[PDB]
Structure formats: structure tokens, C-alpha cells
Design a protein around this ligand. Structure first.
Ligand code: NA
Length: 348
DNA sequence: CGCTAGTCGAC
DNA sequence: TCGACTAGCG
């Protein structure tokens, strides 16, 4: 998503061990463990052969967290945002290409090419994720499938005070306003923690350590919701937001030529895309597990009409969102593939 | 030379 | 493929 973010604010990082969060709750972006565990199963998953290695791989980290008296909440990605469905189609298409090519290379003889094609065509299905869910629930670990992107859901869990930290490899969590993010954690619990409050330890940020300005910077530098203007990265965006002190971000973006001491004419499409990206960071749908219902990541302000935020996620019935969050309902087909009932401690 | 982004290198 | 590294842009 946001390239070079970690290195840009590395001064706010600190090497920790997760035993720090003993007796507390930590949410997990399970996609990193799942992906790192599916790497080994590449050849065997490509051939459609039964695998459980990635399951035990995730259960390594889970049992590790449990051994240090930590309550982990495994969070999974859900439906793809309407604006990214085409990109998803492209990804699956390319993975299919490398899959078939991997088969042809398997028939030719070269095993290196075939396996390297298989590891570059890994498709984390929902069946695998559900296997991880069952394996985790058998150990008493709560699971949660996000309505859409897992990042937003995790960010909500942290903001709601449900969890104290987020384990992930995606630094984009910082743009979602996460307080504590644990990156690069190994199987033993050694990680690199970034705290929002420590953002001020980054001199190059200046006064851009507030959530809003930090978000603006991250978006302007280039994110998954909106590609940056040509020649604009973290340093340029940060400099622009430092030299400017106007709450109206749009007018600031329009005067991006002034702050960069040149002649820049910003397209209106990029402005609308910026508004949509910001609104997606702010109000993307997530699942409240306490009230058991769909809510925006942050409460709607006075200058936003919820009916115009279809790109940030579409509402469905709360019981449907519940069945999805439990992993009982398939994301794509909406078929009930499981009948787990939490009522028979995340869902009070 | 600061900085972005194309490309290297591990998976 | 994807994050890190640095060639080369401005
Ligand atoms: Na950029």
C-alpha cells in the first residue's frame, strides 16, 4: 500500500517482546501468518492436494501468544471493495496464469520454475482461512471475518479499546489511525512495535503527527485507494502538509505547485479520488462484535452523506454480517458453509 | 544531493 | 510476488 512508510517513521519504532501484553488482548492480521504458511504448501496447494501445514504454522504463533498469557483475536479479510474488484480479478487471473505455466513447467521437467511459479501464484482461499478458524476455535481462540478489508476491522478493534495492539506486516494500519502496531514478529514473539504517540519522535514529520494530517500524508504519498501524483512520495507530501496550515485539504492539494515551488495543475479526478480515499480510510464498513452490527470505522461527521459512500462498503442485514463475521457464510457465494454459534466471549 | 520509484533479491 | 535497495530523476 503505502511504500516506505516504516522507514520514514522508524524513529517511532521499538523492539519488543509480546509478553509485554501479558493478560491483555491483541488482534492479528492473520493474512501474514496464512501467507507465510502457504508458501511451503505452494506445490501441494497448486496440485489441489490436501494440506494442513499452514494451519499448524498459524497455530505456532497462536500457541506462542497463548503461552505468554495473551488473548489473541484472529481477523480475516472479507468482501473486496467495489473499487478493487477489477484489481482482484487481475490478481486471480495472473495467479491462474502462473498456475497453468507451473503445470506446463511441471510437465517439462524443471521443478524450480514450477515451484517458483506456484509460490508466486498462491491464492489464499476462504476455505484455508476457515480451516485456520476452526483450528483456532478448537483452542478457544476468537476469530472474526471482516466485512471488507481486515485493516479497517483491526483499526476499529484497536480504536474501540477491544484490543491493545495489532500484529501485522502491513504498515497501512498506521494510516487507519491505529495506536499500537506490532510488525515483523517471529515465531518466538520478538517484534518491532510502533506507537502512534511516538510519532513525534520523527523530526522530519514536523507537526504532521496528528491522525488527520498523517492520513493526508499517507494518501498523498500514494496508497491502494489512490496512486500518487508523479514525483510525489512521503517526503514531498509531508513537506506540503508542513508548509500548509489550512484545514481545507482540497485547496492545499490545489496549491501543491506553490508548496513545491513549481507549476502544478492538479486534475479534478485526483481531487475526487482523494476525497474517496480519505472517506474510505475514515468510514469503511467494519463489524462491531459487541453490538453485533455493521458500523463505519469512524462515526460520520457533519460534512458527509453516508449514501454517497458505496465505495467504502455497502450495508447488509446485521444477521448476515454476523454470519459472515463468524465465518459461517461464504464471502463470494453467500452460502451457509458452517453453523458455529457463539451464544452456545468476544460476542457479549 | 534529496527524493522517488524502478528493480533487485528472498520467498 | 513484494518489500527492500539504490540507480537515476529533478
Ligand atoms: Na508516490
Amino acid at each position: 500500500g503505502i511504500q516506505g512508510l516504516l522507514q520514514f517513521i522508524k524513529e517511532a519504532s521499538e523492539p519488543i517482546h509480546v509478553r509485554k501484553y501479558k493478560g491483555q488482548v491483541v488482534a492479528v492480521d492473520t493474512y501474514c501468518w496464512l501467507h507465510k504458511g502457504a508458501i511451503a504448501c505452494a506445490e501441494k496447494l497448486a496440485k489441489g492436494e490436501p494440506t494442513d501445514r499452514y494451519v499448524g504454522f498459524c497455530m505456532k504463533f497462536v500457541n506462542m501468544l497463548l503461552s505468554h498469557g495473551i488473548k489473541p483475536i484472529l481477523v480475516f479479510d472479507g468482501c473486496t471493495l467495489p473499487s478493487k474488484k477489477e484489481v482482484e480479478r487481475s490478481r486471480r487471473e495472473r495467479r491462474q496464469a502462473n498456475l497453468l505455466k507451473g503445470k506446463q513447467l511441471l510437465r517439462e521437467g524443471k521443478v524450480s520454475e514450477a515451484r517458483e511459479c506456484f509460490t508466486r501464484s498462491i491464492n489464499i482461499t476462504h476455505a484455508m482461512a476457515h480451516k485456520v478458524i476452526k483450528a483456532a476455535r478448537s483452542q478457544g481462540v476468537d476469530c472474526l471475518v471482516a466485512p471488507y478489508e481486515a485493516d479497517a476491522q483491526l483499526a476499529y478493534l484497536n480504536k474501540a479499546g477491544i484490543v491493545q495492539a495489532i500484529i501485522t506486516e502491513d504498515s497501512d494500519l498506521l494510516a487507519f489511525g491505529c495506536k499500537k502496531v506490532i510488525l515483523k514478529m517471529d515465531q518466538f514473539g520478538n517484534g518491532l512495535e510502533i506507537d502512534q504517540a511516538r510519532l513525534g519522535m520523527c523530526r522530519q514529520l514536523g507537526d504532521v503527527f496528528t491522525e488527520e494530517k498523517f492520513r493526508y500524508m499517507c494518501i498523498l504519498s500514494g496508497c491502494d485507494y489512490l496512486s500518487s501524483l508523479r514525483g510525489i512520495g512521503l517526503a514531498k507530501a509531508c513537506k506540503v502538509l508542513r508548509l500548509a496550515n489550512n484545514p481545507d485539504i482540497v485547496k492545499v492539494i490545489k496549491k501543491i505547485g506553490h508548496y513545491l515551488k513549481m507549476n502544478i495543475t492538479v486534475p479534478e479526478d485526483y481531487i475526487n479520488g482523494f476525497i474517496r480515499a480519505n472517506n474510505t480510510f475514515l468510514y469503511q464498513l467494519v463489524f462491531d462484535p459487541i453490538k453485533r452490527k455493521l458500523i463505519p470505522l469512524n462515526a460520520y461527521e457533519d460534512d458527509v452523506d453516508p449514501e454517497t459512500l458505496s465505495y467504502a462498503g455497502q450495508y447488509v442485514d446485521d444477521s448476515i454480517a454476523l454470519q459472515i463475521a463468524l465465518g459461517n457464510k461464504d464471502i463470494n457465494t453467500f452460502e451457509q458453509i458452517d453453523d458455529y454459534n457463539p451464544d452456545t466471549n468476544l460476542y457479549f
